[PDB]
RNA sequence: GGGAUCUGUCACCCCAUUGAUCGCCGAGAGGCUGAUCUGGUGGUAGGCGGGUCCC
């Protein structure tokens, strides 16, 4: 894929960025 | 060696469900991070590896 990440609504987002 | 913007990672919470899909529990609406993905120089919230720019 052109890009990727690791994010989960209702729980976490600073786990990636 | 230091700081931030960049990236990769890990326990917290917010915002968008007129952003997208699923799973589980629930007669039922409803609930759960339960799994995944996306987005906010939202957060002097914490740590660590790589790279960039400045000093």
- Three-class SS of A1-17: CCCCCCCECCCECCCCC
Experimental method, per PDB record: NMR
* Residues A4/A15, Cβ–Cβ less than 8 Å: no
- Report the distance separating Cα A11 and Cα A1, nearest Å: 25
State phi, psi for A12 to the nearest 5 degrees. Answer: -155, 145
Tokens of A9: 């609504």
- Asked whether strand B has any atom less than 7 Å from the CB of A17, the reply is yes
Place of tokens 């990727």: A4
Tokens of A6: 């690791």
**Bases of strand B lying below 7 A from some protein CB:** 7-17, 19-20, 33-40, 42-43, 45-46
Nearby residues of A13 by Cβ (< 8 Å), 6 or more positions away: A7
The separation, in Å, between residue A16 CA and nucleotide B46 C1' comes to: 15
Tokens of A12: 């976490």
Maximum alpha-carbon separation in chain A? 26
């Amino acid at each position: 894929g052109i890009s990727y990440g690791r994010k989960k609504r209702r729980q976490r987002r600073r786990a990636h960025q």
